[PDB]
Design an enzyme around this catalytic site. Structure first.
Site, PDB file in Angstrom:
ATOM      1  CD  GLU A  48     -15.726 -12.577  53.700  1.00  0.00           C
ATOM      2  OE1 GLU A  48     -14.663 -12.704  53.309  1.00  0.00           O
ATOM      3  OE2 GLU A  48     -16.463 -13.454  54.006  1.00  0.00           O
ATOM      4  CG  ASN A 101     -16.591 -19.456  59.155  1.00  0.00           C
ATOM      5  OD1 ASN A 101     -16.302 -18.270  57.884  1.00  0.00           O
ATOM      6  ND2 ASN A 101     -17.008 -20.548  58.470  1.00  0.00           N
ATOM      7  CG  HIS A 118     -19.847 -14.497  55.348  1.00  0.00           C
ATOM      8  ND1 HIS A 118     -19.091 -15.595  55.187  1.00  0.00           N
ATOM      9  CD2 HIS A 118     -21.051 -15.062  55.189  1.00  0.00           C
ATOM     10  CE1 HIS A 118     -19.864 -16.956  54.667  1.00  0.00           C
ATOM     11  NE2 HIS A 118     -21.058 -16.343  54.972  1.00  0.00           N
ATOM     12  CG  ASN A 149     -13.812 -20.571  69.527  1.00  0.00           C
ATOM     13  OD1 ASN A 149     -13.948 -21.778  68.945  1.00  0.00           O
ATOM     14  ND2 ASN A 149     -14.034 -20.450  70.845  1.00  0.00           N
ATOM     15  CG  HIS A 174      -6.343 -16.522  54.002  1.00  0.00           C
ATOM     16  ND1 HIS A 174      -6.872 -15.368  54.339  1.00  0.00           N
ATOM     17  CD2 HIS A 174      -7.442 -17.594  54.034  1.00  0.00           C
ATOM     18  CE1 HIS A 174      -8.177 -15.588  54.135  1.00  0.00           C
ATOM     19  NE2 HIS A 174      -8.560 -16.656  54.212  1.00  0.00           N
ATOM     20  CG  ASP A 190     -13.170 -18.746  57.734  1.00  0.00           C
ATOM     21  OD1 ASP A 190     -12.984 -18.410  58.834  1.00  0.00           O
ATOM     22  OD2 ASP A 190     -13.383 -19.943  57.140  1.00  0.00           O
ATOM     23  CD1 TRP A 201     -21.573 -25.638  53.856  1.00  0.00           C
ATOM     24  CD2 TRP A 201     -19.242 -25.575  54.294  1.00  0.00           C
ATOM     25  NE1 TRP A 201     -20.992 -25.127  52.955  1.00  0.00           N
ATOM     26  CE2 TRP A 201     -19.759 -25.066  53.018  1.00  0.00           C
ATOM     27  CE3 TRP A 201     -18.068 -25.771  54.579  1.00  0.00           C
ATOM     28  CZ2 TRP A 201     -18.876 -24.301  52.142  1.00  0.00           C
ATOM     29  CZ3 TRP A 201     -17.224 -25.346  53.845  1.00  0.00           C
ATOM     30  CH2 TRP A 201     -17.309 -24.489  52.782  1.00  0.00           C
ATOM     31  CG  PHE A 230     -14.828 -25.046  60.317  1.00  0.00           C
ATOM     32  CD1 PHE A 230     -14.981 -25.407  58.825  1.00  0.00           C
ATOM     33  CD2 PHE A 230     -15.546 -25.709  61.174  1.00  0.00           C
ATOM     34  CE1 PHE A 230     -15.889 -26.225  58.471  1.00  0.00           C
ATOM     35  CE2 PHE A 230     -16.636 -26.603  60.923  1.00  0.00           C
ATOM     36  CZ  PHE A 230     -16.727 -26.787  59.532  1.00  0.00           C
ATOM     37  CD  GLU A 239     -13.850 -19.565  48.891  1.00  0.00           C
ATOM     38  OE1 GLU A 239     -14.356 -20.428  49.740  1.00  0.00           O
ATOM     39  OE2 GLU A 239     -14.193 -18.428  48.847  1.00  0.00           O
ATOM     40  CD  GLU A 265     -18.355 -16.383  52.047  1.00  0.00           C
ATOM     41  OE1 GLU A 265     -17.150 -15.820  52.722  1.00  0.00           O
ATOM     42  OE2 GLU A 265     -18.841 -17.432  51.953  1.00  0.00           O
TER      43      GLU A 265
HETATM   44 MG   LIG Z   1     -16.666 -15.560  54.836  1.00  0.00          MG
HETATM   45 NA    NA Z   2     -12.475 -22.195  57.071  1.00  0.00          NA
END
Ligand SMILES: [Mg+2]
Ligand code: NA
Ligand SMILES: [Mg+2]
Ligand SMILES: [Mg+2]
Ligand SMILES: [Mg+2]
Ligand code: NA
Ligand code: NA
Ligand code: NA
Lengths: 1016, 205, 206
Positions: A415, A101, A417, A596, A356, A200, A994, A600, A536, A460
């Site tokens: 990205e 992620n 992140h 991993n 995606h 992700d 989360w 998720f 999102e 992100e």
């Molecule tokens: Mg991300």
């Molecule tokens: Na996800």
């Protein structure tokens, strides 16, 4: 020869250098086909100048680029296999795909990558016509290569290229020969560009998009932009076409731009080359700007996607065509005025979703059929917009969105992140060239598509000065679309739209530097004037989307809340096979992949094979384009369409007592955009029989459309009409008592109460037993993904609901009998029991029950439950038993027909529902609590009937097995049928997966609870 | 390792005709540094022993094109090289003419390619490094300004590349230096793709 | 000032409107800001000289404003009053007479200040070309500067002649200008626009 060798080419390590993002790559441009006939370009026939190299290639896998032998450059290796291109080589077993992620899949040390860098060597042997090599220019186009590659043609090194989600083109004119030719492509899994590709998703590699050859004349069209302007009421439009040429300028060259509406030409223009004066030095000699006037143009929108065809001809003054290109043109104006995002002068309400590019079998290879299926499903479920999740998509996607009518947010492939503090690269000027390439090439490729209404700078990556620079660049080059970016708090100077991620409706989330205000509060912060569109929201992990109706109430109430994009469309699960060859869906860690993030990767509204989850119907209901109000006896219908009249709509209505229908009718819908229609129902029936009357309306589309079939239901609503309380009134059961049991007889029925435990242990009909497990209280559920709520696989949370329940001992609480007493009434037997559930001497819950067995054979159960105020509120309050019978159908009078929860029941309708037992189980890939039906007045399993006001689920799997099993394919049906009947059930949450997200009013926080059940 | 340091390989990728490549192995820009090991010296701005000037006498040879440079220049000084002072413009020593043009480019306009007749200046300096410098820490070379693009070699090994003529270029030499005698070789090209952004109204040197 | 000038392109912004040249321009701007941002004497950043107006200029202007908001940014490109400058900075705009050129007019500075919607200060980046016997009309510029609050001055072109020393057959040095070295097409004596001689001897205009 020495400089074409692997030893020289690999020495500079271009894949570990942010300064080198390509070598000898051609300029980006809108899609070209090089038609030599104007009619073929207009009708979009296949062009003979564009040749697809997709098919069979030779492939060999190596652990590192240094391991590749020098012989591969001149001839195919003996050990090379033959594979289909495009493809990801992880989907052929060469190395494992990795799902991570946030944490990077490699050690964080930019710009360096590990020496163990998996390498894929592709080679193709093909033939070129002599006419192609006689004149003009031949280029090769790689639509997408993950993640960086070196290119050789006939043993000579050509170019490099990095960005994985945008096309790379190289000139092959000087490298090709007549007859047989060989291409060699060395693809590296990791590069310095991987640091900007931390999305992700599954991390794969290879030549995952199309490969083609394009032949163009030496004097050629190199670029063309289209722009549309309008007057105040959109009655007059001007089509702005700027064309750029490459080659040698000649006085006889001309450019013609013609606009075609289906089959008739509506406008046309011709001009010689040479633009307007730009500055002190003059103008562009190799450019021409064509202006076309269109009277009363048909406007493009998601509701009505009217398209024109624009054909651009480069030709001589005498009339000889040199080359033609074409594109679809949509007339539409997007702008932000006074804090509102407007399309064609009307404020938009975004019913969006993040998508995606994912296929369970082919990984990240996309095909037309899957894209079309996705678009059809999205439109059928009342979505009107899609966000390309953190990278540019396949080129055909935008064409399909143009044709079918979806708004598109186009995102640059950036990205970071996994950086600390997440803007380490985006605030560094040394990485500005790479980011700039990723943004500018996407804008150059996609700027002509009408479906693209918003540019996005990535996802992100914090907030850095590079973001501000690129925002200003886009605003300078393409001022016709707003730019958004979420990073660094969602309201920075690099965004035209406040675009938070998972901001809640009413509750603030005060993080130190990047707080997530509630969206309502966010709108009114001092100095804030921009519109708010969530990029999102409503994380759809597993059994989720609780609280969706609150978001949509907020969207409709507030003008500057213009909607959002749900996360997300499709689960990212992959297919594996067992020893028997039976396929099963796999998630993170199932391939032995380096650290991993487990399940998720599955946050979709549909399964990987595009089978809907139950939450999709809730999304469809909340997003529907007709809103209903009932003021007896008038239904007021309000259209939320902005542009189209309701010409394919028919309103059906029905009144039922139980269903048991009583009356029905049909009314055509005639409502203007944002208009209102009053529908007067005829005299409704007034039965004297007891029961609640329900009115249900549905809007049906009788005619098929490009995206739906005849009879499609697009909107519905239900109401309660009138209730008649039941005021009517209805052998003596024999009680036999022993020191172990209380046993009751009535005719051919027997009930057995175990005096040591205090629970109903067995029930008889004739001589056959009905229970495999005694009827007992239940206060726990197999935890949902929202209950587990641990984003990173290593970051344990003591605040998650499952952790609180475990620590309090809810899953290990032992019931202690407090009382078990039986009395024989005049016409009934009364059983009174009491239990206390305790964990290390602390009483968690107390249950007091009365069982009343009357002379009619029915058992009335009354339950009163006290919950300790200091324990975490329980998941459910109810009963649980395992029935011996396995019946085929389940019939109930309640909310349905699909799975619904107290948090997620606005889409379900009260009626009589009948489904096979298998339909009562939702097969989430990660097993959890599922299949609940709320608002139930009556339930019919095989011989039994339960009546009251309860929620139930019924399946072949116990809660314990669902709790203990990590994959749905490992579940095994139990001997009988498990039944859970709940007086009360907690919400499911879903604002994010989360952190705790069940609102306070859907928690079981009342101290005391009471419910009643009749078992007949 | 030696084949990739040779002139044929290094010059084969014509980095000076490529707007995408403006440098190779160049360090990040920063405000002026002197690396004082004493706070008083930094406060009073005394000369620092950690900052050593290489200005002085260098060996120079002029060539009409980069392809004309012999491979022996990378290992030892050419017999025909002269000794010149650095810093300096080689047009002020008679090797080729300075050009004054106001607006019109001094070369044919065809970005980013430059003429094949590209005058080339080969500078070499033989110097000595203290062992304490090579025992620990990091040693970098700073070129305050080079017109208009250059390749750098240290002890026969290729180090890096740089373009912008009016800003400093710095390269890490820690892995290239040895104790005692060291030789730097600098190949300076008059024209590059960066020359297209340097069309100021002044003498072109 | 960043080391960017593309005066010889047709149009002047051919390179600065091209995304392929954005990395090189960005290097030239960002490295200068990184090197010089601590100097108190530096009060204004400049994006270059005579390169038209392109989107790359807007991008780099915004980058500087993000990284170093303590100094204004100026640029004379396509018209001296574009979106990439905080200061109207025309070149050789006259005090009272307009110079209407297509697409990049040189208004008189007094008129320029009051064009509808214009609020920025005006500082001439180049004025009073001091070629030879020149600087006539300088007093008019300075009367205007003192009368108008938003006319905050300018930079004269320029300080020192760009003449080079050559030697005759007797070895007597003499000052040379364009074309005296046999140089490929040249612009003769236009290299000498200074207020002082190349050896720093004042001209009368000083
Ligand atoms: Mg991300
Ligand atoms: Na996800
Ligand atoms: Mg690279
Ligand atoms: Mg270069
Ligand atoms: Mg100039
Ligand atoms: Na709204
Ligand atoms: Na003034
Ligand atoms: Na001059």
């Amino acid at each position: 020869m020495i400089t074409d060798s692997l030893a020289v080419v690999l020495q500079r390590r271009d894949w570990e250098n942010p300064g080198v993002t390509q070598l000898n790559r051609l300029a980006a441009h809108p899609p070209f086909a090089s038609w030599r006939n104007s009619e073929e370009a207009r009708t979009d026939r296949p062009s003979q100048q564009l040749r697809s190299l997709n098919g069979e290639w030779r492939f060999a896998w190596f652990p590192a680029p240094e391991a590749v032998p020098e012989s591969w450059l001149e001839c195919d290796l003996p050990e090379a296999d033959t594979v289909v291109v495009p493809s990801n080589w992880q989907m052929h077993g060469y190395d494992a795909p990795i799902y991570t992620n946030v944490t990077y899949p490699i050690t964080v040390n930019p710009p360096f990558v590990p020496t163990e860098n998996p390498t894929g060597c592709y080679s193709l042997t093909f033939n070129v016509d002599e006419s192609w090599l006689q004149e003009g220019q031949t280029r090769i186009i790689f639509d997408g290569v993950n993640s960086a590659f070196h290119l050789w043609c006939n043993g000579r090194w050509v170019g490099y290229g990095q960005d994985s989600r945008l096309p790379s083109e190289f000139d092959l004119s000087a490298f090709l020969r007549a007859g047989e030719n060989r291409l060699a492509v060395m693809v590296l899994r990791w590069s310095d560009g991987s640091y900007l590709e931390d999305q992700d998703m599954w991390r794969m590699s290879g030549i995952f998009r199309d490969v083609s050859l394009l032949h163009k004349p030496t004097t050629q069209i190199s670029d063309f932009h289209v722009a549309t302007r309008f007057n105040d009421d959109f009655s007059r439009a001007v089509l702005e076409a700027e064309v750029q040429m490459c080659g040698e300028l000649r006085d006889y060259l001309r450019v013609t731009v013609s606009l075609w509406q289906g089959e008739t030409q509506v406008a046309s223009g011709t001009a010689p080359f040479g633009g307007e004066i730009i500055d002190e030095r003059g103008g562009y000699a190799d450019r021409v700007t064509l202006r076309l006037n269109v009277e009363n143009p048909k406007l493009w929108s998601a509701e009505i996607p009217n398209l024109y065809r624009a054909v651009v001809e480069l030709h001589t003054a005498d009339g000889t065509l040199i080359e033609a290109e074409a594109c679809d043109v949509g007339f539409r104006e997007v702008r932000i005025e006074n804090g509102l995002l407007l399309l064609n002068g009307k404020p938009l309400l975004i019913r969006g979703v993040n998508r995606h590019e994912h296929h369970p079998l082919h990984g990240q290879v996309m095909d037309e059929q899957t894209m079309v299926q996705d678009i059809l499903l999205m439109k059928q479920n009342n979505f009107n917009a899609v966000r390309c999740s953190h990278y540019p998509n396949h080129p055909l996607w935008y064409t399909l969105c143009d044709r079918y009518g979806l708004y598109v947010v186009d995102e640059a492939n950036i990205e970071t992140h996994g950086m600390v503090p997440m803007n380490r690269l985006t605030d560094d000027p040394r990485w500005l060239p790479a980011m700039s390439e990723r943004v500018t090439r996407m804008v150059q490729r996609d700027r002509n598509h009408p479906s693209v209404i918003i540019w996005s700078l990535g996802n992100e990556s914090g907030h850095g000065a590079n973001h501000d620079a690129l925002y200003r660049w886009i605003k300078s080059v393409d001022p016709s679309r707003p730019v958004q970016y979420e990073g660094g708090g969602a309201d920075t100077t690099a965004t035209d739209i406040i675009c938070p991620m998972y901001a809640r409706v009413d509750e603030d989330q005060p993080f130190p530097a990047v707080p997530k205000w509630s969206i309502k509060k966010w709108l009114s912060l001092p100095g804030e004037t921009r519109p708010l569109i969530l990029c999102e929201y409503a994380h759809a992990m597993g059994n989720s989307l609780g609280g969706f109706a609150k978001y949509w109430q907020a969207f409709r109430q507030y003008p500057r809340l213009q909607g959002g994009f749900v996360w997300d469309w499709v689960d990212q699960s992959l297919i594996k096979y067992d020893e028997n060859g039976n396929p099963w869906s796999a998630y993170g860690g199932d391939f032995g992949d380096t650290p991993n993030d487990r399940q998720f990767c599955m946050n979709g509204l549909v399964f990987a094979d595009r089978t809907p989850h139950p939450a999709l119907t809730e999304a469809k209901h909340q997003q529907q384009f007709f809103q209903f109000r009932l003021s007896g006896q008038t239904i007021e219908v309000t259209s939320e369409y902005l542009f189209r009249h309701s010409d394919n709509e028919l309103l059906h209505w029905m009144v039922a007592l139980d269903g048991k229908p009583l009356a029905s009718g049909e009314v055509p819908l005639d409502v203007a955009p944002q208009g209102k229609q009053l529908i007067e129902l005829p005299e409704l029936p007034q039965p004297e029989s007891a029961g609640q009357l329900w009115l249900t309306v549905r809007v049906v589309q009788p005619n098929a459309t490009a995206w739906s079939e005849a009879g499609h239901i697009s909107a519905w609503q239900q109401w309660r009409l009138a209730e008649n309380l039941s005021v009517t009134l209805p052998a003596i059961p024999h009680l036999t008592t022993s020191e172990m049991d209380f046993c009751i007889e009535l005719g051919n029925k027997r009930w057995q109460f175990n005096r040591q435990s205090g629970f109903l242990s067995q029930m008889w009909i004739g001589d056959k037993k009905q229970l495999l497990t005694p009827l007992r209280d239940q206060f726990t559920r197999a935890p949902l993904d929202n209950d587990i709520g641990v984003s990173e696989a290593t970051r344990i949370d003591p605040n998650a609901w499952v952790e609180r329940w475990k620590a309090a001992g809810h899953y290990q609480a032992e019931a202690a009998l407090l009382q078990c007493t039986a009395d024989t009434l005049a016409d009934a037997v009364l059983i009174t029991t009491a239990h206390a559930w305790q964990h290390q001497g602390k009483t968690l819950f107390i249950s007091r029950k009365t069982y009343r067995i009357d002379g009619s054979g029915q058992m009335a159960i009354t339950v009163d439950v006290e919950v300790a105020s200091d324990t975490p509120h329980p998941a459910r309050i109810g009963l649980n038993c395992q029935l011996a019978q396995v019946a085929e159908r389940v019939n109930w009078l309640g909310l349905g027909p699909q799975e619904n929860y107290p948090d997620r029941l606005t889409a379900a309708c009260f009626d009589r529902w009948d489904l096979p037992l298998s339909d009562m189980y939702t097969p989430y890939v990660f097993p959890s609590e599922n299949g609940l039906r709320c608002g139930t007045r009556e339930l019919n399993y095989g011989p039994h009937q339960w009546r009251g006001d309860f929620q139930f689920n019924i399946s072949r799997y116990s809660q314990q097995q669902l709790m203990e099993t990590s994959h749905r394919h490992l579940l095994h049906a139990e001997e009988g049928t498990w039944l859970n009947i709940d007086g009360f059930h907690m919400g499911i949450g879903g604002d994010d997966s989360w952190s705790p997200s069940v609102s306070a009013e859907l928690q079981l926080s009342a101290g005391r609870y009471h419910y009643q059940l009749v078992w007949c | 390792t030696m084949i990739t340091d040779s002139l044929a390989v290094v010059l084969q990728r014509r980095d000076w005709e490529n707007p995408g490549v403006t440098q190779l192995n160049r360090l990040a820009a920063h405000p002026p540094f002197a690396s004082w090991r004493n706070s008083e010296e930094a406060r009073t701005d005394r000369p620092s022993q950690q900052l050593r000037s290489l200005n002085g006498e260098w060996r120079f040879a002029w060539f009409p094109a980069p392809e004309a440079v012999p491979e022996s220049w990378l290992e030892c000084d050419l017999p025909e090289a002269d000794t010149v002072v650095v810093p300096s413009n080689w047009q002020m020593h008679g090797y080729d003419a300075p050009i004054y043009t106001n607006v019109t480019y001094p070369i044919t306009v065809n970005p980013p390619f430059v003429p094949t007749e590209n005058p080339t200046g080969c500078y070499s300096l033989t110097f000595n490094v203290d062992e304490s410098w090579l025992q620990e820490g990091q040693t970098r070379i700073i070129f305050d300004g080079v017109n208009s693009a250059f390749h750098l070699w240290c002890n026969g090994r290729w180090v890096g590349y740089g373009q912008d003529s009016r800003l400093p270029s710095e390269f890490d030499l820690s892995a290239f230096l040895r104790a005692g005698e060291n030789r730097l070789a600098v190949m300076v090209l008059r024209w590059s793709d960066g020359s297209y952004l340097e069309d100021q109204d002044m003498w072109r040197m």
